[PDB]
Amino acid sequence: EYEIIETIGNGAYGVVSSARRRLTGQQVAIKKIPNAFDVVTNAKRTLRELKILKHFKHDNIIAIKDILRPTVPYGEFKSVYVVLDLMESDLHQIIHSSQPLTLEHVRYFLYQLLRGLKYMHSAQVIHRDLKPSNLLVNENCELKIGDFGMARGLCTSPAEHQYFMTEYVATRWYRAPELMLSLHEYTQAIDLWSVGCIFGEMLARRQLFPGKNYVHQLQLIMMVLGTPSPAVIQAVGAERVRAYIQSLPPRQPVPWETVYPGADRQALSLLGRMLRFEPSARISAAAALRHPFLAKYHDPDDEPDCAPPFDFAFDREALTRERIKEAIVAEIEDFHARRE
Ligand SMILES: Cn1cc(NC(=O)c2cc(C(=O)c3c(Cl)ccc(Cl)c3F)c[nH]2)cn1
């Protein structure tokens, strides 16, 4: 049914290969999740991502094109094969390379990212791990958000460690203040912090806050944003961090013009609207698409919401590996039923 071209990916998620459907000739990416059901944690993530990707139909979100059916007896179905959009590169590789990236690239890439988040956010899904390398880009310059392993809804299970240990959620360099400090306000605004970090990175083609560890991360952020306000300092979850921040002299925010000298005025306008300490002070995805910097591409008339919202209830459930296997197989059957 498929003709393998070459291998490209490894690992943590599995193995990725480029391929073509024999009948159509159309090119795809095939991900093998080997021994998919052997570990509960992994199996749970697999089910969560299968449901998420099947839920979205959006040009700026990686899509499942096919899932191969077991052609073996059920008991020997060990590894899962997912067929996905083939994407040549990603935003990290592009930013950190000798490829072009003018203001127009920045503008268009940001536009698509935000377009994808408006959709995803409206379904009540926080990605929680946006970074350049999770944003794939194909030969046509389409940007697609992938890697939904970290994604959660607005109210989650206290049985997960992450519920309390927010400072370990996602990736340090793009991790929102509210996660670092446990500000007890966990919304889609988490993503808009990461977007700001990505935006900044694209403007200078280097990482905005590359802290070596926890404390240095906070220091790097505060070098630009200044010290958090009193109101935020009070809201800090743990005593020692709270105390640490209070131990520093007040610092005034640096205007973005200084951080990124000579950069587009309209770009820094929007950037500033995203990188603020307080979650609810940050611009939303939907509103950022309205900002003058994205004038050129914004079309209210082609930036859909996602109905209905995604429900994360299934993830809360306590299932054995063998039940998770069934649930995943049901999703493969459902995929094909819904088509054929
Ligand atoms: C450099 N290069 C990468 C490819 N592969 C693709 O086309 C491709 C990747 C995806 C993903 O959902 C995805 C995966 Cl599988 C692993 C990790 C992350 Cl972060 C992802 F986003 C979908 N298609 C080919 N070359």
Residue numbers in the entry: 54 to 393
Could you pull the original sentences from the published paper?
Smaller, nonbasic analogue 34b provided the best balance of potency and in vitro ADME properties and had good oral bioavailability in mouse. However, N-methylpyrazole 34b had good permeability and low efflux and was also stable in mouse liver microsomes. The structure of 34b bound to ERK5 was solved to a resolution of 2.75 Å, confirming that the binding mode was maintained, with the pyrrole carboxamide forming a bidentate interaction with the hinge region of the ATP-binding site. The methylpyrrole amide lies in a small channel at the mouth of the binding pocket, lying between the side chain of E146 and the backbone of M140 and the lipophilic side chain on I61. The halogenated phenyl ring adopts a conformation orthogonal to the plane of the pyrrole ketone. Pyrazole amide 34b had low clearance and an oral bioavailability of 42% in the mouse. No inhibition or the closely related kinases ERK1 and ERK2 and JNKs 1, 2, and 3 were observed in a kinase panel screen, and 34b had an IC50 > 20 μM against BRD4, in contrast to some of the earlier reported ERK5 inhibitors. Thus, 34b represents a structurally distinct ERK5 inhibitor chemotype, which is a useful addition to the toolkit for interrogating ERK5 signaling. When examining a truncated ERK5 construct that lacked both the NLS and TAD (ERK5 ΔTAD), 34b inhibited its kinase activity in cells with an IC50 of 77 ± 4 nM (mean ± SEM, n = 5). However, a greater than 13-fold reduction in activity was observed (i.e., IC50 > 1 μM) when 34b was examined against full-length ERK5, suggesting that this compound also induces a paradoxical activation of ERK5 transcriptional activity.
Extracellular signal-regulated kinase 5 (ERK5) is a member of the mitogen-activated protein kinase (MAPK) family, which includes ERK1/2, JNK1/2/3, and p38. Activation of the nonclassical MEK5–ERK5 MAPK pathway is associated with increased cellular proliferation, migration, survival, and angiogenesis. In approximately 50% of hepatocellular carcinomas (HCCs), the MAPK7 gene encoding for ERK5 is amplified. Phosphorylated ERK5 associates with, phosphorylates, and activates a number of downstream transcription factors, such as the myocyte enhancer factor (MEF) family, c-Myc, RSK, c-Fos, c-Jun, and Sap1a,8 which are involved in the modulation of apoptosis. Selective ERK5 kinase inhibitors will therefore be useful in elucidating the role of this signaling protein in cancer and determining whether they represent potential therapeutics.
